[PDB]
Amino acid sequence: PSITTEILKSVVARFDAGELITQRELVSRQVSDDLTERAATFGLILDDVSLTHLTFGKEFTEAVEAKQVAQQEAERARFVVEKAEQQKKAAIISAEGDSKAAELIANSLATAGDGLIELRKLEAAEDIAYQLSRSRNITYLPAG
Amino acid sequence: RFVVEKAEQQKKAAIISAEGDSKAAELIANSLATAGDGLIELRKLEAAEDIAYQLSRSRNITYLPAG
Amino acid sequence: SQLITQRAQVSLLIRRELTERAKDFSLILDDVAITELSFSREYTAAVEAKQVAQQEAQRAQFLVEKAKQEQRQKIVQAEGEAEAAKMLGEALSKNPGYIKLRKIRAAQNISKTIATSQNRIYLTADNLVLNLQDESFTRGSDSLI
Amino acid sequence: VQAEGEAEAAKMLGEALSKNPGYIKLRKIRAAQNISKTIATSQNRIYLTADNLVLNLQDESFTRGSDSLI
Amino acid sequence: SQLITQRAQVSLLIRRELTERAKDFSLILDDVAITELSFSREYTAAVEAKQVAQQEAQRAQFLVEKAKQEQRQKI
């Protein structure tokens, strides 16, 4: 109950978490050396020294999981970029439609004037009043 | 010290992101220097529609008239 | 730090001193072991926070990898916007009337979106153009002369 | 370290925005959109101006955006 | 990633070292199988989100097809 404990705790203090996990064999071998040396003086002999379980604190494990999640999100960013390329194609097509529409309307209104805009404003006022008429969450207040 | 190491990685990431921002700004500046700001007005209208849609499901958003 | 990282040497020092003191009482020490060695709650939390910060610094390396993709995404989006601006600005330079028409349509669209929304909306009654005696009644028509 | 990053960013970004700062405006629009998403599911109480809905077509400011394009 | 995509090689390594260690106790290993290999909730969710993003990138291709029709409608 004493020697083992101390020896183990004395060897784990030689390594950090990364070394403890990725060099588990070296840690076990050093624990075995120390424990064999100490137990020889009590007439005992060790047939096997094994580090069977090795974990860390809650917060540290959360931090490690967050690091690996960040790696996965970096991987996901590539598919976000592919979506962005498709979005660029779609935006260019839609903008070509918008630009053709703007050219047509500009040619018309350069010589015609903005009468259509006023008429559309009145028709849209009627339509918008109709759209909002069924909503109880819409209130109309006078100007000011 | 580990906060400083995180800061160094953040500096690298900030430089890369700012390179992207600067290339984007160069492209858009070249386009708009001759085209004008029509795209900005169109995007404002489209964003008005989109933002109205985004906020439509929230009961904690209220619209009040100007003033 | 010394206590944790020199546990064996601390134990040996304790054993030497304890042997010297126990000889006077005719006692023999066969072994001395530091079985437990822990610290306060606050110090343990601070040590854990330091190691969490180390893991966060290691996590920040993947933010650079994500930043590369974000850079590419920004450039792609800007290329699309630059092309769109190029073609739309020439059309709108002659007459920006399309914007106005588009704006009207936007309003209509928004109205639909707002009809079924969960929001509380307080609109101005001027939207209803019901005050026919207002001085602003003729503004729209007056703008056409 | 942070200032080194910021200075490196500022050099190129300001060189780009000197010709035309329009990117900022576009970026701003996108920011608004992003914020809207963030605000949709938020726990805050938000009181916005109904001017965001561009529903007052007879308002004198209706033509401001288009008028700025002449 | 290596654990999942090299499960057979990891199993062979485990079997080799386990054979060497079990020889000392007069034990014979007939087979070693990694029957389960899973990760935390957060990592699994991140992987699923990455693949969802891949499917979203594939979905964005149809938004171009829709944009063509929207262009025609605008005109």
Author numbering:
A (entry chain C): 120 to 263
B (entry chain B): 197 to 263
C (entry chain b): 151 to 295
D (entry chain a): 226 to 295
E (entry chain c): 151 to 225
Question: Anything the authors wrote about it?
Answer:
Stomatin, Prohibitin, Flotillin, and HflK/C (SPFH) family proteins are found in all kingdoms of life and in multiple eukaryotic organelles. SPFH proteins assemble into homo- or hetero-oligomeric rings that form domed structures. Most SPFH assemblies also abut a cellular membrane, where they are implicated in diverse functions ranging from membrane organization to protein quality control. Here, we report single-particle cryo-EM structures of the endoplasmic reticulum (ER)-resident Erlin1/2 complex and the mitochondrial prohibitin (PHB1/2) complex, revealing assemblies of 13 heterodimers of Erlin1 and Erlin2 and 11 heterodimers of PHB1 and PHB2, respectively.
The PHB1/2 complex resides in the intermembrane space (IMS) of mitochondria, where PHB1 and PHB2, which are 50% identical at the sequence level, are each anchored in the inner mitochondrial membrane via an N-terminal transmembrane helix. 3D classifications of our cryo-EM dataset revealed two main conformations of the PHB1/2 complex: a ‘closed’ conformation determined to an overall resolution of 2.4 Å, and an ‘open’ conformation, determined to an overall resolution of 3.1 Å, that showed increased gaps between the SPFH domains of PHB1/2 heterodimers. In comparison, our ability to distinguish between and accurately model PHB1 and PHB2 clearly revealed an arrangement of 11 heterodimers of PHB1 and PHB2, with the CT of PHB1 extending inwards towards the center of the cage and the CT of PHB2 extending outward. The closed and open PHB1/2 complexes both have a height of ~110 Å and a diameter of ~85 Å at the narrow end of the cage. The diameter of the wide end of the closed PHB1/2 complex is ~190 Å, and that of the open PHB1/2 complex is ~196 Å. In the closed PHB1/2 complex, adjacent SPFH domains interact primarily through hydrogen bonds. Most of these interactions occur between β8 of one SPFH2 domain and ɑ3 of the neighboring subunit. The closed PHB1/2 complex also exhibits an extensive hydrogen bonding network between the β6-β7 loop in the SPFH2 domain of each subunit with the CC1 helix of the subunit in the clockwise direction, when viewed from the top of the cage. The narrow end of the PHB1/2 cage forms a four-layered structure, like the Erlin1/2 complex. After the β9 layer, the CTs following β9 of the 11 PHB2 subunits each turn back towards the outer edge of the cage, while the CTs following β9 of the 11 PHB1 subunits extend inwards towards an ~18 Å-wide central channel.
